[PDB]
Amino acid sequence: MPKHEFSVDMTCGGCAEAVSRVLNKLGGVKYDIDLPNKKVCIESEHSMDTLLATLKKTGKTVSYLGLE
Ligand SMILES: [Ag+]
Ligand SMILES: [Ag+]
């Protein structure tokens, strides 16, 4: 199953919480948040568009670091 890696402008724990809330409301996702490195790793059959649009709902700078 595709593992997408994203960069999110998370400055503290409450940003990581904001990230989980939006990703939870999305559903169909297993996810991993690395706060010190400002990274979010997402196991999902969801398209990159959807994941990107979802993460951007937080109001924060989001970019795509790619896949594996
Ligand atoms: Ag924060
Ligand atoms: Ag915050």
Side-chain angles (χ1 to χ4, degrees), residues 10-15 60:
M10 295 174 291
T11 66
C12 68
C15 299
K60 303 169 195 309

Side-chain angles (χ1 to χ4, degrees), residues 1-46:
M1 167 162 68
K3 271 180 150 126
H4 300 271
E5 210 187 352
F6 286 89
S7 174
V8 185
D9 185 27
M10 295 174 291
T11 66
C12 68
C15 299
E17 283 177 20
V19 166
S20 83
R21 265 181 268 105
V22 299
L23 289 190
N24 279 353
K25 216 194 176 272
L26 180 67
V29 286
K30 274 180 298 175
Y31 58 91
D32 218 293
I33 295 150
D34 180 13
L35 176 55
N37 291 310
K38 299 202 189 203
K39 279 176 188 164
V40 185
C41 184
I42 306 173
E43 256 195 76
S44 207
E45 297 297 349
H46 275 109

